[PDB]
Amino acid sequence: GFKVAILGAAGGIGQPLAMLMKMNPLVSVLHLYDVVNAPGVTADISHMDTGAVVRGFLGQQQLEAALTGMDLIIVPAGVPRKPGMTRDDLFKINAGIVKTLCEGIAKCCPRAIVNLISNPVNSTVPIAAEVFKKAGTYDPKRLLGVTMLDVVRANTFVAEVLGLDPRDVDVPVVGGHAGVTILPLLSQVKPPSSFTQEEISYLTDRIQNGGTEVVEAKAGAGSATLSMAYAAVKFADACLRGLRGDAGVIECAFVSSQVTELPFFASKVRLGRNGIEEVYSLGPLNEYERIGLEKAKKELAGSIEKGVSFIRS
Amino acid sequence: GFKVAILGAAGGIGQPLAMLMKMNPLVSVLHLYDVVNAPGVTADISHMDTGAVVRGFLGQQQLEAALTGMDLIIVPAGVPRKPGMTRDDLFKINAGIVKTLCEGIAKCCPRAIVNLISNPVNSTVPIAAEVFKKAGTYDPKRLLGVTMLDVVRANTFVAEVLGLDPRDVDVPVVGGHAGVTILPLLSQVKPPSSFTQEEISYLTDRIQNGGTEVVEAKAGAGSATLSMAYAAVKFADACLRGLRGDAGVIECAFVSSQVTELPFFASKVRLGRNGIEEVYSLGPLNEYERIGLEKAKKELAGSIEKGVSFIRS
């Protein structure tokens, strides 16, 4: 099977994500890396009677060992939103975190597929891209910003509205990973379905604010962790099945693309043996989505620039 | 499918356990109860595009609503304590919690299958039994102490020693769920295997101190949560396949039994439509195991009594 490393394995997302990856039959080696508590999480996980062999890595000094020979790097690494935290003080911190980790990835496994979860994806994926570019290891086929939880939420909220089982629903979601950059293409839902105007609006707003919804429900003390781990693993699994060589593995991801005038954009991508085999275009949008698409590009562009400039300085 | 409630869902174990249950296809309704943060975990869990419908419940005043109509109650409820333990101040606190929660179970769903995880199982399962008896809802076919993590650990450690994939290993573990009361029947390992004396001893000791191993790795700040959730779900699933009507569902669990002179003991049990369909005896033991069994019985009786007397006062 494949080798997977999780950077930030001891955090809220990291831990449950490590547990699911540990259970995945396609994983043969699992590396858990963090700057704190990695040994502990690692012991816990290690008792699981599943195929993957797990090892833990603690501190910057051990980052390289964790990344080496990996097929897939999953990066939920990042710091908690607080209160005190602005949304920038945060960016500053996470941007640094991503930068550091990416420099590590650039050095130790240029050909590993990277699943970047570190918030804000809209900026951190471009940050990652710059780092890789500034290191000559940039392969746009291999950098994926995880937008899967957007899709997950979409499927769940649409299924409830449609009274269907979420497992029988698929909603393409494109654009970016934050606020109005998240653009659920309700017009492309499967199974074919009809939504009232209020439904489209409720659905779109709710899918765009899913994170905030959990944050508030956790009374500011925490943000989504479990649904995130679950989404991250569903996505990682698709990447592994792609690496395995399965045909038709398609998922939405925030990637380097030429689908729009923006350098990064989330849209459906086919996952194969070398990462992205094909970035699909948006497909037919209705008027509501075209307008949404415009709102998203506007915010996305600055978000993309904040990240590019973060590194290009 | 089935209705499942998790008492203590916002805790260390609870959250990841809730996540996994949410993903279990036999679960149709998932109730998540706690005295704190239930709303937040539930919101998080609800975004998952899986069949199970999840609802949250916060505080004693909502306990009854959480238990009503459940097919399976999974009770990881309990406090951690960490610094100034005793395991006897803990016991006091958790015996309390178990009592309260069991009283509630006695009232709202006498026929639900109960998976009790609250530490110390060796005592809390008898406490639970007492409560159910003292309320006339005691069905010994429906109270199971989850000892699965013991089996999980065993499978994993034995597999490592035999250089096998843990998935192809099975180790019956009997007796109790703590220290020397945990008796791994290495002589009954499948696939048939041979161990050196030192291996028998290393494996036995390590399986008995598994929890301590994690607690220590966690530098005292926490104990096994992920492998526990993983083990608990594995077990809850077997209970559900039993309920479903599947043939041959066998798992070890700490239960009311007449296998030994002790009232409660862990051994393979067959799970069916009514909970325990059959408690298997220990099967052939070797000398080492008969001695082991003797150590176990002595410590277990006291632990069983500490439980009983707690209630019978």
Swiss-Prot record, chains A, B:
Main location: other
Enzyme class (EC, first level): oxidoreductase
Sorted UniProt keywords: Glyoxylate bypass, Glyoxysome, NAD, Oxidoreductase, Peroxisome, Transit peptide, Tricarboxylic acid cycle
Cellular compartments annotated: Glyoxysome
GO CC terms, sorted: chloroplast; glyoxysome
PROSITE patterns recorded: MDH
Molecular functions (GO terms): L-malate dehydrogenase (NAD+) activity
EC number: 1.1.1.37
Matches recorded under Gene3D superfamilies: Lactate dehydrogenase/glycoside hydrolase, family 4, C-terminal, NAD(P)-binding Rossmann-like Domain
Binding site for NAD(+): G8, A9, A10, G11, G12, I13, G14, D34, N94, I117, S118, N119, M228
GO biological process, one term: glyoxylate cycle
Family membership: Belongs to the LDH/MDH superfamily. MDH type 1 family.
Record note on quaternary structure: Homodimer.
Protein name (database record): Malate dehydrogenase, glyoxysomal
Native species: Citrullus lanatus (Watermelon)
